[model samples]
Target: MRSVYERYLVGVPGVSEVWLIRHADSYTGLEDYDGDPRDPALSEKGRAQARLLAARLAGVPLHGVWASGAHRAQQTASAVAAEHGLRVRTDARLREVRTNWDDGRPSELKPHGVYPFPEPEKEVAERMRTAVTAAVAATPPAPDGTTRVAVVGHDSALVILMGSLMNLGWGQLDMILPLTSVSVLAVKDERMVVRSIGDATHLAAA
Candidate 1:
């Protein structure tokens, strides 16, 4: 097994860092409706969560902010960008893993039910792994010799994506809860070196 430092060195030369933040809670029964995937805005509490997240990242000098095109992620990114005076760049590659079911709608189906379509777990897993690889490959070498990027996404997607990066089994994901959390992965020479997983110290006491 490679050491953490060694993993970082394997990535692009010069240190690159990725801060992954999970979007706050969404409409309780929002999934009940089959609306535009990008139209689900954050709940009131979710908005507050984003604000708190912004305050936590207040001191860091972000090169750029990126968010999934989905409403929840966009809202979260918007909150942070508003506070930092930075604009959010939408990246489809950063969007959540696609599911096999059509957009869930209340009139079309019952609320709190599983996706109507097949769980494409295997495909989703592979895609997530590929996405992480692409994310690492896309990191531009920082002008200061350090690349830093932030991504706001969902809980399941975040967990599965990180697990893929670390070569963890799907069942093992239960061990990692990235809900409304953030993690920093240090990369060098195309590999992850230092991983600070699930650091929510910035969140206020709930």
Candidate 2:
């Protein structure tokens, strides 16, 4: 990561390199699942994926790791945070859209075939942006000139957040992020640069 960024540096000091990650898969099919349908913990495959992501980022000098209030997001963030010996910070503002709909357990889905009462799309993006801004503010750039942080989040809200960062119209944000994927953003001189999006390189070999 450092080697690649060294050459194409943003050339500005006090930059921040943030990693946005979508939580790994969760156990979704069972109606009798042990936890709240809205916030199921990571499945076995999800645990493995989180470990792979942690290993992939082990070399990074992450200043902090943040995640939504969801169990899946926190679990995923914990794995990466463990690698850097940092505690996982939970921000309610970084949570997924409060769709009145439980994540997607077969029994939780409504007959309508879509989330019936999703939070406003604009509001989701706004809160996510607020959380990201707070995260960057809490962790200033390191002496090395660039600060690194990780944020584990959900798909729809994260898509909107990324779109805002890239200066895309809210209506234009319409992609589903793959589970456990990582997107890289570099913040410098008031500009947010998209270094990579939906990168599953770590999961590819898993």
Candidate 3:
């Protein structure tokens, strides 16, 4: 089988595009503090960001919509999908990478001062690559020649997915941040012809 990038390129048309909408800001540090898998909702600012994202994509033709099972992601996707009168589908595979589950904190949290993981970041890089490969494969091809999809997910998941698609290492994932939306990858002929990384022109006001 061709690599994930190759498959995307080959599957997408010249004018085809995919929109990767990173969920906006969350409620607060406390929301993430518990590392609640399904409880956290988007903050006020986050909702605004989602609306902004929706406005940006208002005129574009979106064929499919997907979100991780997390509430924040679901809300983000829902905002955009509502504008288009489309429903969002929850994909478990799209959820954020598994981290330390003990007491809602990972083992790396103790030493790194980061709740998710430590500085090594390599593991996340690899995990992202794997996750993105699977996500791309799971993505259904657009029907009726419509070539764009809107994927609303978390920052970590989006970064890892894009980083892996572009062959970037773990450190590069930092270049992509939380609450930021990026175009990430554009594939044609089973190859990446355009890798639009971190284009937030859509979220200028947010």
* Predicted model with the maximum TM-score: 2
- Flag the better candidate by lDDT, 1 or 3: 1
- Where model 1 places Cα greater than 4 Å from the true spot, the runs are 1-4, 8-13, 28-38, 100-145, 176-179
Candidates' C-alpha lDDT: 0.64, 0.79, 0.63
Candidate order by decreasing TM-score: 2, 1, 3
TM-score of each: 0.71, 0.80, 0.69
Clash totals for all models, in order? 14, 0, 8
Per-residue alpha-carbon lDDT of model 3 for 1-206, expressed as tens digits?
66764554655345445567777778544544455644677776777777887887788777667787888888888888887777787776666666555465554523322334432355655553443444445556666664566777666666666665656654444565547375645644234333575566766664
Candidate 2 local lDDT, 1-206, one digit each (tens): 66555434456566688899999879643444767776788987888889999999898789989999889999999999998879999999988766554576332435443433357667887798778778888885676746888999987788777886766764454456888899988765445667788887887785
TM-score of 2: 0.80
Error of 3 at 82 (Å): 1.4
> Which candidate gets the maximum lDDT versus the true structure?
2
| Better candidate number, 2 or 3, judged by TM-score | 2
- List model 1 lDDT by residue over 1-206, tens digit each: 56644655654346667788887767633446455544667776677777778887777756556777888888888877676666777766566655434556322223443332244445555554454445556655556756666778766666666766777655464544444577886655445533767777766465
